[PDB]
């Protein structure tokens, strides 16, 4: 395989060319959340809107705990919801034209990769069990 990832630096504080307060970032991220944007998109729009590194550095904690604190939690986590959305999209395309055997293969693979994460989420019990992908 290959490596391509971020390299979060050695410092663990706000990078001191910052010229902005702490709760203003909280207001910005709850504003984007009430606009209805997913947490990873909050993270990139906060990397580029005003110069934060990420919220665990600039605020006191991560965006998932700060959105659960501000009351805008997601009922299912990001990767779970995105794999479900990809699964239903490729299922809709295959039911448009059933001859796509590569889409059948990829639907089986996405079903496996979502049942693995559903097994993890049920065994850690952060979503309510009986949840087994419809």
């Amino acid at each position: 395989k290959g490596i391509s990832s971020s390299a979060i630096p050695y410092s663990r504080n706000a990078p001191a060319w910052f010229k902005l307060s702490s709760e203003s970032v909280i207001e910005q991220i709850v504003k984007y959340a009430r606009k209805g944007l997913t947490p990873s998109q909050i993270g990139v729009l906060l990397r580029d809107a005003h110069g934060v590194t990420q919220a665990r550095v600039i605020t006191g904690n991560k965006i998932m705990r700060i959105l659960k604190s501000n009351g805008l939690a997601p009922e299912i986590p990001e990767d779970l919801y995105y794999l479900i959305k990809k699964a239903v999209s490729v299922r809709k395309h295959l039911e448009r034209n059933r001859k796509d055997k590569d889409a059948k293969f990829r639907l089986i693979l996405i079903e496996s990769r979502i049942h693995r994460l559903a097994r993890y989420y049920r065994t850690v019990a952060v979503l309510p069990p009986n949840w087994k992908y419809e």
């Binding site: 959340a33 209805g36 997913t38 299912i76 919801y81």
Partner: peptide, 22 residues
Amino acid sequence: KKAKKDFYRFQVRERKKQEINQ
């Protein structure tokens, strides 16, 4: 820019409330 119509607890409460009402 590319908001979701789902995936938030309060938004799916609003969606099920709209389905309950009409």
